[PDB]
């Protein structure tokens, strides 16, 4: 909790005081009502409109304001960053520009019109690096768009002005060369806007333990409200009634505030444990939910796999040696600065020690990707090395009066079946072979997925990737299921499906296409290597980027549930024992003889209720330290653990109210205040 | 005298369990939808004739059947009382009851309360007593046993959708349980001195030259079923301290045994329908501990008795101001505790003349919800609401998920349980507050000081909990008190029956899981203690202010 986080929590507590925002918290809302009533009572008594000591209702009101403002502050720490933020997506949507064109064949009148201001039918120009301003269609020019925000993959996809590859998407980046677009959606509903609205708008449920605790809170506060309210008629019949200030103060000091603060106390303890685990949790409920997770949806590219599809194995073409193919690949991808060409170079170097062929400046024209011929390469000396897709090189060979062997295509089909994209290589008019760009799984993951299955957690793996590679990696990692070629809508709908069965889902994603799903999951761990959109949606960020850190997040969730149970016993014992300590003072005014019920020998009703409010405030402040210090995280059966919790924390929660209230009262008397 | 009080409690409980055990195994067949041994052909003929097809009912159909029977009984009884000057069996031509008194008596009897703001000797005529009051004694008892049959079936049935047939349940319960037992009890009461005749009132001329006119209704049958169905509606004004209702100590013993017979047999039956007798034994232990402690407290408080008596000039201070010399002070104490724990209402002593604590403890038992051997059927599903609450808080307190009898408990069940538990104390406190802020309500009181408030509180807490007992000094026969207590009785009874049927509905579509780490055993002393704690703490947190300003204020000075 950096300095700025505390100051923001304080501003948001002050800003949540307003009743419209406090209404959603029953106990603290009643404390708010009573605080306001005692403020009005003190202002009256000070105006002379009501006889009595204004400064005692002033003390009560001040302390109830402190109680409410610290409850708001604890719940602004533990939960104000919880909801998903579509800030990076909104930024991309608000800082986008479009080169509107005139005479849209090609045109040269580039009007730097903000992309948000584009309507359907308008023509736009995009060039290398410029993000696609809005959804639409292509009508001239062919390029390679970086459609990574839709699938999650990083391979550039060719959009080529007429066919089935003709619908660009707003937000995706263009890489290869120029491209003119014909918008096809008014700015209201693009794809980017659709998933912005899908991220902010997906709410996370409440843990069932929290709902049960809320029901208990409301039951107890109804009981205490009935008791305290009907105290007036009864007392009024019995001679001397109970002053209204004592009635409102008794009500707002009898209600279970400890239980109300338990949520934020366990929240801040959980986030502290997570930081300990090298996970940056922004939500306190996320940790307890991690304790209760039954499913684990995973992404594939970047989450499970490294996310760049390094090169795996050069493959001959039935005649050429592997050395020749490796030299050709290392020369073609020599200039390539994407991790895939770099990995081709590295692998060629190690497997065939081709150090000789590394030159910063050799006479050698560099032939980068074009998206017209769809193949990169180089021309070093009387050579034309090219590299690219199988069909691109097929076209190149068939056009150069050559021939395309068939076993090269057999190897291509094989490398496709093994879960890898094959890059065919050519030098002139003779295909040299294939380069199996395979996706490297991050590390030792089968062990950890086995451990997750042993912990009773399903393991789905939804990606936006091919079915071939999806299945290959699902087998090679050990996940239960997998759903390939999934759009963000698909992942979000699958999370809604699962968590509609009453279970708690927990997605782990690293890309923009995971932002919806991560926003809706109960425990959404976003990879720290992921994009800012994925890290803003997810409940928590994983600084190790390991996709199996849910194991440790679940160990800590189960520890926070043991701590929630211990302090729930303490809290229930505390509010009940405090009720017995507080109420005998309220009868002394009605019948003299009922001072006998004042076992604690408190001074007066006024001093008992002032001690009560001070105590309720201090105990709500000190619940956080108590939660931060853990409990004996031992495996104990329900009965034995209930007995241990009862004994230790329940007995503590009985002795705490009596001792605490009496020592606060002793301080009030010795000090002279009351 | 402590040896004799102990012997009384011990013999009571021992004979009680000896009787209840077999009857509970007999009721486990009705809960299981098995025809009792001899009655399976007459069932066919009957149910065919009565239009009853033995088609199962979901929780909504079941609840609507019970509520429809109860509303039909309410209408019929109201109009019977209102127009009883036309109906036969009226030796003393008594007029029809008022609209307020007719309404209050109808609502009270239909809801198993049998609160009495009238005098049965000079108010009702044998037809009303026989054809309306005791018919509704049978019907309300059977409605409560049928609701607990539905709840037990919900707990024991796996992934089903129907809680059995309600018409068959009522017919079985009444014909094969309440009626034969009530007939045996009635003929024993007639042997011991109770009345059974439709003669005109008998004109006695005293041994001296005085005059008397004895009331001569059909007392014994209504007595047997008032006790057996924990109804409590007495034939005469003095409820069952009347020589014509409780003629000897023997009939009084049999009356307390009847008051507790079916609640205890429902606990044994619940134990036997889950194949786990230890569940029924757990409920019986939880109830018996509280019952024994309360009986001891009241016996002690009454044997200490009125301090002023010894000073005024007597030989004992034993409080005999509202007790028959036929049953001592110990027996009056035991019956007070039994009747107000069992949601019965019958009194063999005036609870207004009880000492401070002797009136606190019966009232306190009424106010915790009457789950200690509570009303017929009502007591068991009240204690099941409290058992669900205990399991909820246990799960909350260990961190695992709630679970009772293998079936996991959702948050819908928690909402319904909380609302069901709260509906009664809300009625008690709000009704008592309304009665104490209106001149019509506090003026009814008889005693001054805190005991007047004790009277008002006891009346509203008795009506709200469908007990029927009263401090009886309270002149509660005005339109205000009649309508107030009618509302309290109606809402208590049926606003507790409704969430219970909703909970049966949710529970019957579940499946009992297997053991796990989040399954604390609901037997043994740990859960008995947890359940006693839950019951007593809800009751105390709610009523300690109210009780402090009545019985405790009176006790302390």
């Amino acid at each position: 909790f950096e300095p700025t986080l505390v100051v923001q929590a304080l501003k948001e507590a002050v800003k949540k005081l307003n009743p419209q925002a406090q209404w959603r918290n029953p106990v603290m809302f009643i404390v708010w009502i009573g605080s306001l009533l005692t403020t009005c009572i003190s202002i009256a008594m000070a105006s002379g409109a009501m006889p009595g000591n204004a400064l005692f209702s002033a003390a009560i009101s001040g302390w109830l304001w402190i109680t409410v403002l610290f409850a708001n502050f604890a719940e602004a720490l533990a939960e104000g960053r919880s909801k998903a933020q579509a800030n990076s997506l909104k930024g991309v949507k608000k800082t986008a520009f479009a080169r509107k064109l005139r005479e849209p064949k090609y045109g040269a009148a580039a009007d730097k019109v903000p992309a948000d201001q584009l309507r359907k039918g308008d023509i736009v120009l995009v060039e290398a690096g410029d993000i696609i301003p809005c959804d639409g269609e292509v009508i001239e020019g062919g390029a390679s768009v970086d459609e990574s925000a839709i699938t999650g993959e990083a391979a550039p996809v060719i959009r080529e002005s007429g066919g089935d590859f003709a619908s660009v998407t707003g937000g995706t980046r263009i890489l290869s060369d120029w491209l003119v677009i014909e918008c096809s959606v008014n700015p209201g509903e693009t794809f980017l806007d659709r998933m912005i609205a899908m991220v902010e708008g997906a709410q996370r449920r409440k843990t069932p333990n929290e709902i049960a605790l809320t029901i208990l809170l409301i039951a107890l506060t109804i009981v205490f409200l009935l008791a305290t309210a009907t105290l007036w008629p009864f007392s009024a019949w019995g001679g001397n009634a109970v002053s209204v200030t004592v009635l409102v103060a008794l009500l707002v000091c009898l209600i279970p505030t400890t239980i109300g603060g338990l949520l934020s106390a366990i929240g801040v303890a959980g986030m502290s444990r997570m930081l300990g685990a090298n996970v940056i949790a922004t939500s306190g409920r996320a940790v307890e939910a991690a304790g209760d997770v039954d499913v684990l949806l995973l992404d594939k590219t970047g989450t499970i796999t490294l996310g760049n599809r390094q090169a795996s194995e050069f493959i001959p073409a039935q005649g050429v040696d592997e050395k020749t193919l490796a030299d050709a690949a290392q020369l073609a991808s020599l200039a390539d600065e994407t991790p895939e060409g770099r990995s081709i170079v590295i692998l060629a170097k190690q497997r065939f020690n081709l150090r000789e062929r590394d030159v910063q400046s050799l006479h050698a024209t560099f032939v980068p990707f074009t998206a017209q011929s769809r193949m990169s390469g180089i021309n070093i000396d009387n050579r034309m090395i090219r590299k690219g897709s199988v069909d691109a090189i097929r076209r190149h060979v068939e056009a150069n009066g050559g021939h395309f062997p068939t076993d090269v295509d057999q190897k291509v089909d094989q490398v496709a079946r093994q879960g890898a994209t094959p890059l065919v290589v050519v030098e002139g008019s003779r295909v040299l072979g294939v380069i199996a760009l395979k996706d490297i799984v991050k590390g030792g993951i089968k062990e950890r997925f086995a451990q997750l299955r042993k912990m009773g957690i399903k393991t789905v793996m939804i990606t936006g990737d091919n079915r071939l590679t999806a299945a290959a990696i699902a087998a090679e990692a050990g996940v239960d299921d997998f759903l390939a070629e999934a759009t963000p809508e698909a992942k979000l709908a699958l999370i809604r499906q699962y968590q509609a069965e009453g279970r708690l889902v927990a997605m782990t994603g690293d890309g923009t296409n995971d932002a919806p799903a991560l926003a809706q999951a109960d425990v959404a761990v976003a990879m720290n290597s992921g994009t800012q959109a994925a890290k803003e949606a997810g409940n928590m960020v994983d600084l190790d980027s390991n996709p199996t850190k849910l194991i440790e997040v679940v160990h800590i969730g189960k520890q926070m549930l043991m701590t929630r149970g211990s302090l729930t016993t303490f809290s229930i014992a505390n509010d009940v024992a405090k009720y017995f300590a507080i109420i005998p003072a309220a009868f002394a005014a009605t019948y003299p003889q009922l001072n006998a019920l004042n076992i604690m020998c408190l001074h007066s009703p006024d001093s008992a209720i002032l001690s009560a409010v001070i105590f309720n405030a201090l105990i709500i402040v000190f619940l956080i330290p108590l939660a931060l210090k853990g409990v004996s995280y031992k495996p104990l059966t329900a009965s034995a653990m209930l007995r241990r919790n009862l004994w230790i924390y329940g007995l503590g929660g009985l002795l705490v109210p009596f001792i605490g209230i009496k020592v606060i009262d002793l301080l009030l008397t010795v000090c002279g205040l009351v | 005298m402590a040896a004799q009080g102990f012997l009384l409690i011990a013999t009571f409980l021992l004979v009680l369990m000896v009787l209840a055990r077999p009857l509970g195994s007999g009721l486990a067949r009705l809960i299981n939808d098995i025809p009792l041994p001899g009655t399976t052909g007459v069932e066919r003929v009957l149910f065919r004739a009565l239009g009853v097809s033995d088609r199962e009912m979901n929780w909504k159909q079941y609840l609507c059947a019970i509520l429809g029977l109860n509303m039909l009984g309410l209408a019929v009884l109201f109009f019977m009382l209102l127009g009883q000057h036309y109906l036969p069996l009226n030796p003393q031509q008594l007029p029809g009851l008022s609209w307020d008194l007719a309404l209050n008596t109808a609502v009270s009897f239909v809801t198993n309360t049998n609160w009495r703001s009238y005098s049965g000797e000079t108010t009702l005529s044998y037809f009303s007593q026989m054809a309306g009051l005791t018919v509704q004694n049978f019907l309300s008892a059977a409605s409560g046993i049928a609701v607990i049959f539905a709840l037990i079936r919900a707990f024991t049935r796996q992934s089903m959708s129907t809680l059995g047939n309600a018409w068959v349940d009522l017919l079985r319960i009444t014909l094969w349980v309440l009626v034969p037992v009530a007939l045996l009890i009635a003929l024993f009461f007639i042997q011991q001195g109770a009345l059974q005749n439709f003669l005109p009132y008998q004109a006695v001329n005293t041994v001296e030259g005085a005059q008397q006119l004895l009331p001569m209704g059909p007392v014994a049958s209504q007595e047997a079923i008032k006790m057996l169905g924990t109804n409590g509606g007495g034939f005469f004004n003095a409820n069952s301290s009347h020589p014509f209702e409780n003629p000897t100590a023997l009939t009084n013993f049999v009356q307390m045994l009847a008051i507790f017979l079916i609640p205890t047999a429902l606990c044994f039956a619940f134990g036997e329908v889950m194949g786990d007798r230890r569940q029924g034994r757990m409920l019986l232990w939880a109830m018996s501990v509280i019952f024994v402690i309360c009986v001891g407290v009241v016996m002690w408080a009454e044997v200490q008795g009125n301090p002023h008596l010894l000073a005024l000039g007597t030989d004992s201070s034993i409080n005999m101001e509202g007790k028959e010399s036929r049953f001592g002070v110990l027996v009056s104490s035991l019956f007070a505790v039994v009747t107000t724990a069992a949601s019965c209402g019958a009194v063999i002593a005036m609870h207004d003349s009880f000492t401070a604590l002797g009136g606190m403890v019966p009232m306190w038992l009424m106010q915790i919800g009457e789950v200690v051997f509570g009303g017929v059927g009502s007591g068991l599903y009240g204690m099941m609401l409290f058992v669900l609450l205990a399991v909820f808080i246990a799960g909350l307190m260990i961190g695992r998920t709630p679970e009772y009898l293998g079936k996991k408990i959702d948050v819908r069940e928690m909402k319904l349980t909380a609302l069901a538990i709260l509906v009664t104390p809300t009625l008690v406190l709000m009704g008592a507050a309304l009665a104490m802020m209106t001149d019509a309500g506090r003026s009814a009181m008889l005693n001054p000081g805190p005991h007047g408030f004790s009277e008002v509180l006891y009346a509203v807490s008795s009506a709200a909990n469908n007990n029927g007992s009263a401090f009886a000094g309270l002149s509660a026969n005005s339109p205000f008190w009649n309508c107030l207590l009618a509302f309290c009785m109606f809402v208590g009874r049926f606003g507790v029956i409704i969430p219970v049927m909703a909970i049966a509905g949710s529970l019957v579509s579940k499946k009992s899981q297997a053991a796990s780490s989040g399954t604390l055993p609901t037997h043994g002393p740990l859960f008995v203690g947890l359940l006693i704690g839950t019951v007593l703490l809800v009751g105390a947190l709610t009523f300690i202010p109210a009780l402090a300003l009545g019985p405790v204020a009176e006790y302390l000075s």
Binding site: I211, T214, I218, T221 | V411, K415, A418
Partner: peptide, 29 residues
């Protein structure tokens, strides 16, 4: 039965209604 007592009664009833509605709608609250 005056201004203050009627205000108190209706406020207590409002709080009871609010708490019962919260209980029935725990999920949101």
């Amino acid at each position: 039965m005056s201004a203050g007592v009627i205000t108190g009664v209706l406020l207590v009833f409002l709080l009871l209604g609010y708490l019962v509605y919260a209980l029935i709608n725990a999920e949101a609250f």
